[PDB]
Design a protein around this motif. Structure first.
Motif, short mmCIF file in Angstrom:
data_model
loop_
_atom_site.label_atom_id
_atom_site.label_comp_id
_atom_site.label_asym_id
_atom_site.label_seq_id
_atom_site.Cartn_x
_atom_site.Cartn_y
_atom_site.Cartn_z
N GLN A 57 29.70 57.52 34.36
CA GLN A 57 29.51 58.98 33.41
C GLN A 57 27.98 58.71 33.17
N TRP A 93 36.57 58.31 35.67
CA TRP A 93 36.24 58.42 34.51
C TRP A 93 36.47 59.93 33.74
N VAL A 94 36.45 60.84 34.92
CA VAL A 94 36.80 62.22 34.40
C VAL A 94 38.39 62.34 34.57
N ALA A 107 31.06 67.00 29.10
CA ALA A 107 30.88 66.47 30.30
C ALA A 107 30.87 66.99 31.52
#
Ligand SMILES: *[C@@H]1O[C@H](CO)[C@@H](O)[C@H](O)[C@H]1NC(C)=O
Length: 319
Positions: A57, A93-94, A107
């Motif tokens: 991220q 992470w997404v 994001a």
């Protein structure tokens, strides 16, 4: 004379090829990729995707994408940049994150703004959103759709346009090159973005076809015009035509006819700006395990030697 020269004579902006960074140490490979008689445009096959550019991220990583741009720039080739928002090749992470609408939008927008700003002015086109649709024309149940709902698509386009107002913004997908629920849904995505008030300039038609099962020149042309009628340009963005193995003379000849029809459909369509093949040599073709049993998809063979499909493309480009 080559594919790119022929294409430009017919009014296309380019004929081009994807590549990937592991291939670039092969100087013989690079010499032909750099031949602007055949290729006026390059797509990075992997190094501008989210897994490559933001693997953790906020941690932007551009060296491999920049190396492809630098090669294209040295050669005087255009770039198509690929791809910003996609359900595949997304870092965990997404895809696995605990999101709310606001936090995922933050994001997603941060990803777009950083990547598009970094490449500002270097790209002819961005595939902003890739493969948002299922085969039956429903939205894919990706993390973006589930958390944000359909608005993620126009927001991604608006965000890209804010970062780079002049690059052409494309919605890119496969199995939208022939008529059906999926192509209809792709039309509806175009209309939806435009209705939201966000900029969409193009539809990218990936054109991953099969030898002997490729849509006719006539079918392809009709479908292209269904998109251009909505007020977008079109391009074939990932063309390859895999054949059922083993290769045979009859299949190589059919493959030539198939490639010929795709090039001719583009040349026939006002607003079709170009064709990009998904790499150019069978040695580096994309044939993942789900297509085991298929292969030899490209106009040059694994030894960098032209196959009949090269002549079929030339014929389709009117050369
Ligand atoms: C997320 O926010 C956007 C931007 O305001 C909005 O269009 C969309 O409806 C929202 N979705 C949800 C699930 O709240």
């Amino acid at each position: 004379a080559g594919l790119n020269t022929a294409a430009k004579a017919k009014g296309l902006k380019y004929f081009g090829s994807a590549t990937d960074n592991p291939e670039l140490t092969d100087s013989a490979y690079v010499a032909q990729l750099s031949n602007t008689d055949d290729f006026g445009q390059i797509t990075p096959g992997n190094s501008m995707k989210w897994d490559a550019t933001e693997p953790s991220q906020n941690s932007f990583s551009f060296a491999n994408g920049d190396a492809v741009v630098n090669l294209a720039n040295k050669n005087g080739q255009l770039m198509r940049c690929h791809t910003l928002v996609w359900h595949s090749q997304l870092p965990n992470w997404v895809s696995s994150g605990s999101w709310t609408n606001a936090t995922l939008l933050a994001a997603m927008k941060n990803h777009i703004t950083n990547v598009v700003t970094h490449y500002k002015g270097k790209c002819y086109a961005w595939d902003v959103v890739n493969e948002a649709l299922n085969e039956d024309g429903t939205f894919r149940n990706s993390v973006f759709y589930q958390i944000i709902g359909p608005a993620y698509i126009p927001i991604a386009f608006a965000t890209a346009a804010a970062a780079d107002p002049d690059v052409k913004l494309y919605y890119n997908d496969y199995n939208i090159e022939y008529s059906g629920a999926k192509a209809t849904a792709a039309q509806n995505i175009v209309k939806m973005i435009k209705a939201y008030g966000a900029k969409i300039d193009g539809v990218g038609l990936q054109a991953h076809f099969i030898v002997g099962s490729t849509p006719s020149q006539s079918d392809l042309t009709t479908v292209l015009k269904g998109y251009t009628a909505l007020g977008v340009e079109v391009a074939y963005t990932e063309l390859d035509i895999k054949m059922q193995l083993p290769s045979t003379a009859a299949k190589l000849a059919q493959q030539s006819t198939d490639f010929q029809g795709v090039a001719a459909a583009c040349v026939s369509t006002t607003g079709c700006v170009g064709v990009t093949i998904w790499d150019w040599t069978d040695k580096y073709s994309w044939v993942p395990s789900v297509f085991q049993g298929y292969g030899a998809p490209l106009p040059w063979d694994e030894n960098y030697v032209k196959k009949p499909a090269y002549d079929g493309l030339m014929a389709g480009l009117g050369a």
